[PDB]
Amino acid sequence: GPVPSRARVYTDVNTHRPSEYWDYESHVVEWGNQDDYQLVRKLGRGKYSEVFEAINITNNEKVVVKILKPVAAAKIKREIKILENLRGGPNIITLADIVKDPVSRTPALVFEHVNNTDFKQLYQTLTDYDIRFYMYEILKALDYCHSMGIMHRDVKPHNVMIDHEHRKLRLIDWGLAEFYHPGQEYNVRVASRYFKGPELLVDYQMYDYSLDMWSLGCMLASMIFRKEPFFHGHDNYDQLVRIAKVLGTEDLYDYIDKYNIELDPRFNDILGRHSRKRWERFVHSENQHLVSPEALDFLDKLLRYDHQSRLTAREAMEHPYFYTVVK
Template sequence: GTNIITLLAVVKDPVSRTPALIFEHVNNTDFKQLYQTLTDYEIRYYLFELLKALDYCHSMGIMHRDVKPHNVMIDHENRKLRLIDWGLAEFYHPGQEYNVRVASRYFKGPELLVDYQMYDYSLDMWSLGCMLASMIFRKEPFFHGHDNYDQLVRIAKVLGTEELYAYLDKYNIDLDPRFHDILQRHSRKRWERFVHSDNQHLVSPEALDFLDKLLRYDHVDRLTAREAMAHPYFLPIVNGQMNPNN
């Protein structure tokens, strides 16, 4: 599939019988170094490439469930991106309850943190939103929780507690009693609050609009991968790929 790591072979150790998967090689640059150097255009370019992979796997009925920088290999010299580590991936069946112990803490959607099991592909779109926020605001990770409970608190400090309770009510979700002491009350913050002199060159009205349509409590409100690719944020990329001579 597009921008999905290619499995070349499976070999077995003759003695231990341990199987090993052999994948294509990607000359990856560590994201902690790379993300600090990316331009506005490059961020748009790589997120568009990542969306191609997500749109492909979602269209095949698969949720990745562990989208994060460590699982996005980027060969910057060749402008090549590959989505790797399909160990947590799962087929989506409407109405099925899934394990919430997936994804990595900083990229876990609210549905995982409140133990809502009927999630779907939109979980990956939350994780993508976390990556977008960390890239344009130069804040890695964007939601920096110390544990899974604190992770929801960090999200609520940005998206608001009233909005959180409205989401919980809609799905009849009972919050773990442990949250009552730590959640407190927080108003929704404007995305502009995270813009400062070091990151303003990466932020635009369309970037904030795109981010706002990904980082939503309610998974049904998030853009799909296909919808995301049609967002104005990617117009420079789409125009560039249609007219490669630009």
């Protein structure tokens, strides 16, 4: 069978905190007044929720209301427990209230409002300095939630709100987040395709916080190399082939052999043989201003098949790539 794995950091957090901390099923939800919030406009719909711009009439403040679809309503206690546990943490979205939506009859989470700068404007105009700045702000959020025994499991640009005018960042959508328990086998059907770690793609369930570090590396590669997403798989299988065309097949086989993982035989006719590519291939006159030896070294230390070998969030914070960032 597969070789067990455990995180190299924060393994003991959930065993040394009381059962009340991680046992989200036992937690009792206190409901607020749904008529305190007037819905203004729908911002989006996903498979687990609908998100609205709203106004809190008890203070006159803009808020975001997320109304959970009945499918996600089953695992609301987990999201609420994670949001309450992390509330006040650096760059974590603040849960302001929880109400019962009168239409869906499902829980509706009320969050602080972030005046989000359009994704395209950010993706097209952030400087080398700003990219480093915002990556460092994401690292604060990830080190915080990992230090609190939580993995996000859905790190991606869509889940990072940036108010560029106020240089304010928030990591949102904690709906796929989970408490990390060493030895626990987790669902690999997490994160979005382009950001899924090789551990998920090869069906290795004993993963940990380091999955978030791979997703972060995917975001960095996309930004500095101007390819969004960086690893653009047609499906979960082709997603691993796309990675292997850059990082090579040899380190992939060393990875699966280390953990005694048996690859799905469907990979035999699609994976091929690929050498690891040097990053200069992805550097052109247009994006050279975003690329530096420090950016490449930092990326090399995130985008590793072996989840145990990746930089942790705290280690990533002292990488030379952030020396130019005002602290």
